[PDB]
Design a protein around this nucleic acid. Structure first.
Length: 127
RNA sequence: GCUCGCUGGGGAUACUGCGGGCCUUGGGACCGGGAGAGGCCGGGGGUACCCCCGGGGUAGGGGUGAAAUCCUAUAAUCCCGGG
């Protein structure tokens, strides 16, 4: 009789998304992102915005009855960056603090086995 | 002395040339156990990515030094079941 779900965190260099679903992941419970909390695009990937979005999502999950969550951190992966953005550990800490028990913590970034060609050309970004 | 040479003869046989004989060291042929992303053909997989369908879920998503073009209410970003 324990309510355990899964908290998927999408962390990038432009935004952070916190999405709380059931144990099977087929039932959305709460979904919050930085852009729905902060007013500026530059502030979207900030750890403060991640913490606020995580707090709102945790409050919604607690209201709906979820008491524990399994963390699933994810960078964009694929041909894009494979490292999580700044607002991932902050979101995890906010989830732990807001009143949700924390279970397994794993990284589920999609790692290609020599997949598609990344964008930017053979010379990359030249800034 | 020079005309950078030609020609009639005699002698020598070390080297080169030519003819003959005998060798294996260089190079080839063959056998043995192994090494290697060497090449061609055939059959099975690996995640990743894109698109389509169904379920969940609402308002943003992406992107940059900052933005904007762009996608999104015909239900987007995100999660799950399939092709």
């Amino acid at each position: 009789k324990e309510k355990w779900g899964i908290a998927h965190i999408y962390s990038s260099f432009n935004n952070t998304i916190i999405h709380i679903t059931d144990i099977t992941g087929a039932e959305t419970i709460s979904r919050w992102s930085g852009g729905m909390v902060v007013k500026a695009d530059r502030d979207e990937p900030s750890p403060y915005a991640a913490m606020l979005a995580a707090r709102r999502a945790a409050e919604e999950a607690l209201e709906k009855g979820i008491v524990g969550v399994h963390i699933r951190v994810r960078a964009p992966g694929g041909s894009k960056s494979k490292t999580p953005g700044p607002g991932a550990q902050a979101a995890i800490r906010a989830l732990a603090r807001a009143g949700l028990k924390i279970g397994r913590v794993e990284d589920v970034t999609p790692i290609p086995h020599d997949g598609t060609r990344p964008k930017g050309g053979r010379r990359g970004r030249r800034v």
